[PDB]
Design a protein around this ligand. Structure first.
Ligand SMILES: C/C1=C/C(=O)O[C@@H]2C[C@@H](CC[C@H](C)/C=C\CC1)O[C@@](O)([C@@H]1CSC(=O)N1)C2
Ligand SMILES: Nc1ncnc2c1ncn2[C@@H]1O[C@H](COP(=O)(O)OP(=O)(O)O)[C@@H](O)[C@H]1O
Ligand SMILES: [Mg+2]
Lengths: 502, 366
């Protein structure tokens, strides 16, 4: 039951635990269905747990692009981006001028509006009772509002909540003392819906099947834009209250492990079958924590790296056209570490699978020519054979194949017929060979390239034959020696012989 | 130092680095020059040539797998090195791919351009089908490579293509897109222009499939709507694609659909095997590898399995391999080959080129 592919070893999860996620499970089910229908793997950055009810209410808009003012983690504005950044997280409170300018510029550039903040009864109960973020509400008889303070952030600031009816909903409007006077609390809202922005569903990565990879149809990412539209359509929010936004903000020089994990991944349903990670290899839920809604929960960088490898192995990859930040505190995120196992296995397989004689010019024996051909250690056999009149081996490596070449075999090599040897090859010293290239009649080559034929898994070897005015120069490489190296060597010796009228 | 891998496709250039599992760049094999020849750039390549199509004349320099315009091909290589990969070619050994049966004069010209124009330190030219066989983890087998402008059956023995037995079919993805435009136009729609060809190429890639039994599927399409799929056109109109889903790739098996008198891909596979030594034929039947974009149709491997089985001796063991990454297997095979230690012994060095000239490619590359 253990998953094994090269250096990737995954052991079954003993006692699967339930992991808390910020994304409402109704939307997790939607994203699981989108991954199946679209045949893609979608990764979504964690949503802050405390913002779940805000998203579940389906009343708000979500964080769009070009908003550099940050959210608050305290008071009744928790989970929203206050226009007055003194009400935001500690990093904004200690850099007021910088953050207040970001909020103001977001409005001035048409990227946000200043909106009123209404909270539902669920939110008031969460802040008072579940999280104890606010002190119990106390009716202030003069204004008719309920006063409360935050139990974190600045505990000296009073907030005032007023019961209002907004489009048939009984909500609580947030008010505060602005320059000492009661005023409606303002948050950054979306420019088209005018509704406050909560956290959005920030896509971490999208991995597509091979068929969906390739050049774009941009006649000036379209696939990612199209997928985001399918997601928003399937999420079914009112127009203007979308959870996913087209485009993406800068990578940002920040880390925080809570901003990247636990990430929720959504995958095609075939990953959940018994042969999910391959024939008899097990289902993805055996090695990764998957909930009832089909969300694959990735808790840390090692799990993210392992999940990415399983997806890559299953032929799902991030696009060339798409831009992702995905990683953060990288264990082995380089391209060289995430290579497909089909690529590495094929490379390993290929590396394994690839492995009266006249006096010679000078007058000092033909054996010196054989010694020359055998010197660089690339060849196991070499021969110089006269082919005119009665053919004979002038010189050859003793105890090898070429020394036994016959006149019948020479006749096939130099014969007029250049097609019968394609039926089942030819022999050289009795050794069966296949013809790879017959360039015997090509000017400037006068050569034939062959490869021996053998039984089972016994090695085979490349052979080149080059024809001169009176001789055939034959060479056989050792195991693994490329045919081009042998052809070049045979060509060079043949040229030398042709220069001396041989 | 990293070797570069450039797959010079009839429709798409796939380029990248050896040792990577996918190309870094995939772009159209087109060059665009301003329409008025008798006259702020002299020429445009790929994506940019398509974006500025309103002011340029577009041409495919490798229309049918064979390079015909060397000036436009040099622009493609320059774009690939400098603009897509952002490398200095003189610093990298470069593996180029070539069509099966590429003319000697063509591979000589490609070698000369690499060394004389780009000054690469070393280069090699590999047959595309051989690289796809390597990407499947094999050295012996028969590859059916169907791309944009050309289709070939390539039998291979231990890494060496057997040119006497290579079969070429002058029909590929581009012809299938043209045929789909014709049969949709027959229904009252109009798909005629270059831009409409691109819409139909999208329809073809998203909805077409190979039927296991064509006549049975034609009968089903005429008796029910179970095979119909809807496609939204750029103008908002919706078109229903029915029997066109499988009539379009049926042309691979029946080239008479487009007026061609050629045998189908199953018949050319048999013919190609039969042109090889008797001794290797069992190994070829058991190792049929599908490669190229035009082999992506769902159902194509099961149809090839049925068709080859019907042709071959009944005891023949037949196996069709259609990798999920087969659109890029030529490139992937080149990355495998150029990342192996045996590759340094195979490349043609500048020293070897200086000594022998362009004809060195005949000796070293096969
Ligand atoms: C997305 C894409 C795919 C492709 O395969 O593109 C290649 C290259 C392309 C060049 C012209 C085109 C207008 C430009 C870009 C399209 C690139 O032509 C093709 O689309 C041709 C024409 S229709 C067909 O099936 N092949 C194939
Ligand atoms: N999913 C698919 N279904 C059918 N045809 C496809 C698919 N994907 C790509 N193609 C087609 O494959 C061709 C491009 O394939 P490729 O092997 O890159 O060609 P080349 O190497 O000749 O440039 C085009 O005709 C394209 O429409
Ligand atoms: Mg190709």
């Amino acid at each position: 039951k253990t998953y094994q592919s090269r250096d990737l070893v995954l052991e079954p999860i003993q006692h699967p635990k339930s992991i808390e996620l910020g994304m409402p499970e109704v939307d997790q089910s939607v994203l699981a269905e989108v991954a199946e229908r679209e045949n893609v793997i979608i990764g979504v950055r964690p949503v802050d747990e405390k913002s779940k009810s805000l998203i579940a209410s389906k009343m708000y808009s979500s964080m769009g692009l070009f908003v550099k003012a940050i959210s608050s983690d305290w008071g009744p504005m928790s989970g929203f981006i206050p226009v007055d950044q003194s009400f935001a997280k500690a990093s904004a409170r200690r850099d007021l001028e910088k953050f207040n300018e970001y909020a103001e510029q977001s409005i001035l550039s048409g990227n946000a509006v200043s909106a009123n903040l209404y909270l539902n009864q669920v939110r008031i109960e969460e802040l008072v009772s579940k999280y104890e973020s606010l002190t119990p509400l106390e009716l202030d008889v003069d204004s008719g509002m309920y006063k409360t303070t935050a139990t974190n952030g600045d505990q000296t600031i009073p907030f005032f909540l007023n019961k209002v009816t907004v489009d048939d909903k009984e909500l609580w409007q947030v008010h505060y003392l602005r320059e000492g006077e009661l005023a409606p609390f303002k948050v950054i809202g979306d420019p088209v819906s005018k509704q406050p922005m909560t956290a959005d569903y920030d896509l971490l990565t999208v991995m597509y099947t091979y068929g969906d990879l390739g050049p774009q149809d941009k006649v000036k990412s379209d696939r990612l834009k199209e997928l985001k539209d399918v997601i928003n359509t399937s999420l079914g929010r009112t127009d203007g209250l979308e959870m996913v936004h087209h485009g993406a903000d800068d990578a940002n020089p920040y880390a925080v492990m809570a901003d990247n994990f636990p990430a929720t991944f959504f995958v095609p349903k075939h990953f959940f079958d018994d042969d999910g990670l391959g024939e008899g290899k097990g289902s993805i839920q055996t090695y990764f924590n998957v909930n009832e809604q089909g969300a694959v929960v990735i808790q840390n960088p090692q799990e993210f790296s392992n999940f990415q490898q399983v997806a890559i192995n299953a032929s799902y990859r991030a696009s060339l056209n798409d831009k992702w930040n995905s990683g953060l505190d990288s264990p082995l995120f380089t391209t060289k570490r995430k290579l497909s196992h089909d690529y590495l296995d094929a490379r390993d397989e290929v590396a394994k699978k690839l492995g009266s004689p006249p006096p010679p010019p000078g007058g000092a024996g033909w054996n010196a020519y054989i010694d020359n051909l055998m010197a660089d250690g690339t060849c196991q056999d070499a021969a110089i054979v006269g082919y005119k009149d009665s053919p004979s081996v002038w010189a050859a490596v003793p105890g090898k194949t070429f020394v036994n070449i016959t006149p019948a075999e020479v006749g096939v090599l130099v014969g007029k017929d250049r097609s019968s040897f394609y039926v089942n090859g030819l022999t050289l010293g009795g050794q069966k060979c296949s013809v790879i290239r017959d360039s015997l009649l090509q000017d400037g080559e006068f050569s034939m390239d062959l490869r021996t034929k053998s039984t089972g898994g016994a090695p085979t070897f490349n052979v080149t034959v080059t024809k001169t005015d009176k001789t055939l120069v034959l060479l056989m490489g050792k195991e693994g020696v490329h045919g081009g190296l042998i052809n070049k060597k045979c060509y060079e010796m043949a040229s030398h012989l042709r220069r001396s009228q041989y | 130092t990293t070797a570069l891998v450039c797959d010079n496709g009839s429709g798409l250039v796939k380029a990248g680095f050896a040792g990577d599992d996918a190309p870094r760049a995939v772009f159209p094999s087109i060059v665009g020059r301003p329409r008025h020849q008798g006259v702020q750039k002299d020429s445009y390549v790929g994506d940019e040539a398509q974006s500025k199509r309103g002011i340029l004349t577009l041409k495919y320099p490798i229309e049918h797998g064979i390079i015909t315009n060397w000036d436009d091909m040099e622009k493609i290589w320059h774009h690939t090195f400098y603009n897509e990969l952002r490398v200095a070619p003189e610093e990298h050994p470069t593996l180029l791919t070539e069509a099966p049966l590429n003319p000697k004069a063509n591979r000589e010209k490609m070698t000369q351009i690499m060394f004389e124009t780009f000054n690469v330190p070393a280069m090699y030219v590999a047959i595309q089908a051989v690289l796809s066989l390597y990407a499947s983890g094999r050295t012996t087998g028969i590859v059916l490579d169907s791309g944009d402008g050309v289709t070939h059956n390539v039998p291979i023995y231990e890494g060496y293509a057997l040119p006497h037995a290579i079969m070429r079919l002058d029909l590929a993805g581009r012809d299938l897109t043209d045929y789909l435009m014709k049969i949709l136009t027959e229904r009252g729609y109009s798909f005629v222009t270059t831009a409409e060809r691109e819409i139909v190429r999208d329809i073809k890639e998203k909805l077409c499939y190979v039927a296991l039994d064509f006549e049975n599927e034609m009968a089903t399409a005429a008796s029910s709507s179970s095979l119909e799929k809807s496609y939204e056109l750029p103008d908002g109109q919706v078109i229903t694609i029915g029997n066109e889903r499988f009539r379009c790739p049926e042309t691979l098996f029946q080239p008479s659909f487009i007026g061609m008198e050629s045998a189908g891909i199953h018949e050319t596979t048999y013919n190609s095997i039969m042109k090889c030594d008797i001794d290797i034929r069992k190994d070829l039947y058991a190792n049929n590898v599908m490669s190229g974009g035009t082999t992506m149709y769902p159902g194509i491997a099961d149809r090839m399995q049925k068709e080859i089985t019907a042709l071959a001796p009944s005891t023949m063991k037949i196996k069709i391999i259609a990798p999920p990454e087969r659109k890029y297997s030529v490139w992937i095979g080149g990355s495998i080959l150029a990342s192996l230690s045996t590759f340094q012994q195979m490349w043609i060095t500048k020293q070897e080129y200086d000594e022998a000239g362009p004809s060195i490619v005949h000796r070293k590359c096969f």
